C-alpha cells in the first residue's frame, strides 16, 4: 500500500498548479473554451478581476488584456489644409480598453 | 522526529526572505497576488514570501523634465525654445495604474502644451517679455 | 530591457542625464530617474562621437581582476 | 537560408520591420511576418550607417557566456 | 572565572565606542531610525547640537548636515536686457541651511 | 590557385557569376563555368564595396564551430 | 575616479598636463598639482588627436609580465 | 633583410614584380631575378592601395595547419 | 626614457634616423648617436604615414616563436 498512496500525491499537486492562474492588478484575463468563450448572465462574456481563478488544465485558455491607458504616437505625415498649405504634424492618442470582451472579439486575437 | 526537523527548515527561509527594508525616499506598495493590499510607510516591514510583493516608489525625490523643440510663433516666425520643468510624484496607486509610462506620456503632453502656448504669442514677445 | 534602436532615438532626443557602460551592457539612469538596460549590437565607430556632441554624461568602469 | 545580398536589396525596399543581431548570425523578421536567416560574411562599417538612415529597427543581443 | 569576566569587559568597550557619535561645531547631526527620523515635541524632528550623543549601535543612522554658509558661483551666461542687449555677467550667491530637517527631506540624501 | 590581384581585375569586368565567401579562402564562379581558388593577402576595406559597385552577388556562410 | 565626459571637457579647458596610459587607467594631473583617475568607456579614435592637439603630455607603459 | 623604409622607396618606383604575403612577413622577388625578405611592423591601410594603384602583381599564401 | 608626446616633437623636426617597432615598444636612434625608448599608448594610423613623409628609417623584426 506504498506505491498507491505515494502515486496520488504527486499527480494532484502538479494538476492544481496548472489550473491556478492569477490576474495582475493592471491586467484582466478572459477564460476561453475550446473554440468559444465562457458566458453567463444571458450570454455576457465574463472578465476576471485581479484575483485568483481556477481553470480546468489543458481545456481552458486565458487571454490577458491590459486595462491601462495605451499611448499611440503618429509619425510625421503630410496633410492638406483649406488653402492647400501642406503641413507636417506629429500627434499621439491615448485610449483605454472599455469592453475587454468586445475588443478581443472585434480585434480578433487581442493584438495591439 | 525527522519530520519535525524538515518543517523548521522551510519556515525560516519564508520569514528570512519575507523581511525587507524600504528606503526613506521610497514608499513600498505591498500587493496581493492579483490585488493590491496596502501602502507601507518607511521603515522595516514584513511581507510573506511568495504571497505578496512590495514595489518601492520614489515619493520624495524631485525629478526634472526639460521640454524643447522648434515651435511656431503667432507672427509666422520660428523660435527655438527650451524649457525646464521640475516635478515630483504622489500616491503610487494612481501613478502606477492610471496611464502607461506616465513620465514619458506627460512629456508628449508637455510638447503639445509648449507648442500651443508659443503659437499664441509672437516671436518678439517670447524672446524678452513672454518669458515670465 | 529596452531596444537599442529606441535607445538611439531616445539618445537623439536628449533624454539621458547619466550613462554607464560595462562590457557590452548599457545600464542607464536618465534625468527623470527612470532606468532601463540595453546591449550594444556590435562595435560602432561614431556612436561615441554623437554622444559627446550633445553633452551627455558617460562613465566607464575598471576591470574585475579574479582572486 | 536567405542570401546576405538579398537582405541588402530588401532593406533598400523598406520591407523589413525589425531584426535581431547575434554574433555573425542575422536572424530577422520582416514586415510580411516572414522569418529567415543570413550570415554576415565580413565586417561592414557603413552597414549601421545605412540601416539607421533607412529607419529600420535594430536591437542588440547580450554577450553570450557559457555558465 | 577568568574567561567569563575578561570576555564581558572587552566587548563592552567596543560597543560603547560604536554607540557614541559626536556632532562637529560646523556640523549638525539628525539621528535617524531604520527608515524614520527620531521625533519629539509633537512630531518635530530633533537635530543635535555640537556635543556628545549615544546611539544604539547598528540601529540608528546619522546624517551630518553642515551649518556653515555655502558659496555658489555662476559662470558666464547670456541674458537679454530690455533693449535686447546681450550681456555677460559673473555672479555668486551665498546661502545657509535654515531648516536642517527640511533640507534633508527636500534634498533627499542630504546632498548640497 | 590564382593571384589575388587577378581576381580584382576580372571582377572589374564582371567576370564572376556569384561570390560566396568563407574564412580567408574564396572560390570563383566565372561566367564560363570555370572554377579556381584565390587568397586574400590582408584585409581590404573597399573589397566588399567594390563587389557591390558592379551589382556582384554576395553570399554569406554559417560559422564552423568545432564538434 | 572621474567621469569620462567631465574629464574630456576639463581636458579641452586646458587644465591637464600629464597623462599615463596603462591599460584603461589614467593618472590625471591638473595644473594645480591635484591627482585623480579616469577610465575610458570604449575605443575613442579621436582621443589621441584631441589630447595632442591641445599640447598635452601623454605617456605609455610596458606590460607587467608575471614574474 | 631590407628595412621597411627602403622597401617603400623601391615599390614606389615600380621595380618589383611579385611579393609574398603572409602574417606580417614579406618575401620580395623583384624584377632583377633577386629575392630577399622584409617585414611589416604595424598595420597600414595604404599598402594594398599603393600596390593596386601602381598596378603591381601581388599574391599571398594560405596558412599552415598546426603540428 | 622619454615620453611619447616628446618623441613625436623630435620626429617633426627631422631629427630621428632609425626606429624599431616591437609590439607597443619602440627603440629610436637619432642623428646624434643617442638612444632611448618610448611607448605607443594607442594605435595611430597617421603615425607611420607621418614617419615616412619625414624619411625616418623604419625597420622590422621576425616573430619570437617559442621553441
DSSP secondary structure string, E36-76? SB---TTT----B-SSEEE--TTT-EEEEEE-SPEEEEEEE
Burial E13-28 (b: 16+ CB within 10 A, else e): eeeeeeeebebeeeeb
Q: What angle do CA D28, D34, D35 make, to 5 degrees?
A: 40
**Distance between alpha carbon D52 and the CA centroid of its chain, in Å?**
12
- Answer left, alpha or beta for residue C24, where phi above 0 means left and psi between -120 and 50 means alpha: alpha
Separation between Cα atoms, residue H28 and residue H39, nearest integer Å: 10
Chain B touched by C43 (CB under 8 Å): no
- The whole-angstrom distance between G38's CA and the closest CA on chain I is 15
DSSP secondary structure string, C9-49? HHHHTT--S-EEEETTEEEEE-TTS-EEEEE-SS--SSHHH
Grid cell at residue B27? 514608499
Q: Do chains A and E touch (3 or more CB pairs under 8 A)?
A: no
- The whole-angstrom distance between H44's CA and the closest CA on chain I is 7
Closest CA to C43 of G3, D48, A35, B2: D48
Resolution as reported, in Å? 4.4
C31 CB neighbours in chain B (<8 A) are 63-66
H56 CB neighbours in chain F (<8 A) are 5
Domain ranges (residues) in chain H: 1-62
Q: Would you call G42 and C21 a contact, using CB atoms and an 8 Å cutoff? A: yes
Closest CA to H25 of H48, H45, H1: H1
Residues from F contacting H (CB-CB < 8 Å) are 3-5, 8, 24-25, 39-42, 44-45
List CB contacts of B92: < 8 A, sequence separation 6 or more.
Answer: B27, B29, B39, B55, B57, B59
- The partner residue sitting opposite I48, judged by closest CB among H3, H6, H42, is H42
- The partner residue sitting opposite I3, judged by closest CB among G47, G58, G62, is G58
- The partner residue sitting opposite C21, judged by closest CB among G6, G8, G41, is G41
SS (H, E, C) chain G: CECHHHHHHHHHCCCCCEEEEECCEEEEECCCCCEEEEECCCCCCHHHHHHHCCCCEEEECCCCCCC
List CB contacts of G60: < 8 A, sequence separation 6 or more.
Answer: G21, I4, I24, I38, I39, I40, I41
- The whole-angstrom distance between G38's CA and the closest CA on chain C is 8
Grid cell at residue H56? 603591381
| Residues H25 and H64: beta-carbon distance below 8 Å | no
| Residues D51 and D58: beta-carbon distance below 8 Å | yes
Separation between Cα atoms, residue C29 and residue C48, nearest integer Å: 18
- The whole-angstrom distance between I21's CA and the closest CA on chain H is 6
| Residues F9 and F51: beta-carbon distance below 8 Å | no
Q: Would you call B34 and A50 a contact, using CB atoms and an 8 Å cutoff? A: yes
Helices then strands, each counted (H, E), chain A: 2, 6
Amino acid at each position: 500500500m506504498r506505491k498507491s498512496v505515494i502515486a496520488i500525491i504527486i499527480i494532484v499537486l502538479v494538476v492544481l498548479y496548472m489550473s491556478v492562474f492569477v490576474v495582475k492588478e493592471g491586467e484582466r484575463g478572459i477564460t476561453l473554451r475550446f473554440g468559444k468563450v465562457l458566458r453567463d448572465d444571458d450570454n455576457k462574456p465574463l472578465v476576471y478581476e485581479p484575483g485568483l481563478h481556477f481553470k480546468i488544465p489543458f481545456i481552458e485558455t486565458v487571454k490577458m488584456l491590459d486595462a491601462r491607458i495605451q499611448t499611440m504616437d503618429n509619425q510625421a505625415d503630410r496633410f492638406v489644409t483649406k488653402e492647400k498649405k501642406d503641413l507636417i504634424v506629429d500627434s499621439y492618442i491615448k485610449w483605454r480598453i472599455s469592453d475587454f470582451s468586445r475588443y478581443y472579439l472585434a480585434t480578433g486575437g487581442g493584438d495591439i | 522526529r525527522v519530520v519535525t526537523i524538515a518543517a523548521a527548515a522551510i519556515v525560516i527561509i519564508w520569514a528570512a526572505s519575507g523581511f525587507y527594508t524600504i528606503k526613506e525616499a521610497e514608499r513600498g506598495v505591498v500587493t496581493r497576488f492579483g490585488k493590491f493590499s496596502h501602502l507601507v510607510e518607511p521603515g522595516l516591514n514584513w511581507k510573506p514570501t511568495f504571497i505578496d510583493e512590495v514595489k518601492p516608489v520614489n515619493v520624495e525625490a524631485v525629478r526634472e523634465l526639460a521640454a524643447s523643440g522648434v515651435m511656431l510663433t503667432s507672427d509666422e516666425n520660428v523660435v527655438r525654445v527650451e524649457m525646464n520643468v521640475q516635478y515630483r510624484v504622489t500616491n503610487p496607486e494612481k501613478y502606477l495604474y492610471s496611464v502607461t509610462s506616465p513620465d514619458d506620456s506627460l512629456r508628449q503632453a508637455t510638447d503639445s502644451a509648449l507648442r500651443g502656448v508659443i503659437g499664441k504669442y509672437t516671436m518678439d514677445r517670447i524672446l524678452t517679455e513672454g518669458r515670465t | 530591457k529596452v531596444d537599442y534602436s529606441t535607445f538611439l532615438q531616445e539618445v537623439n532626443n536628449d533624454q539621458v542625464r547619466e550613462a554607464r557602460i560595462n562590457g557590452r551592457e548599457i545600464n542607464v539612469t536618465k534625468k527623470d530617474s527612470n532606468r532601463y538596460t540595453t546591449y550594444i549590437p556590435v562595435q560602432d565607430p561614431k556612436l561615441l562621437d554623437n554622444l559627446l556632441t550633445k553633452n551627455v554624461k558617460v562613465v566607464g568602469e575598471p576591470p574585475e581582476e579574479p582572486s
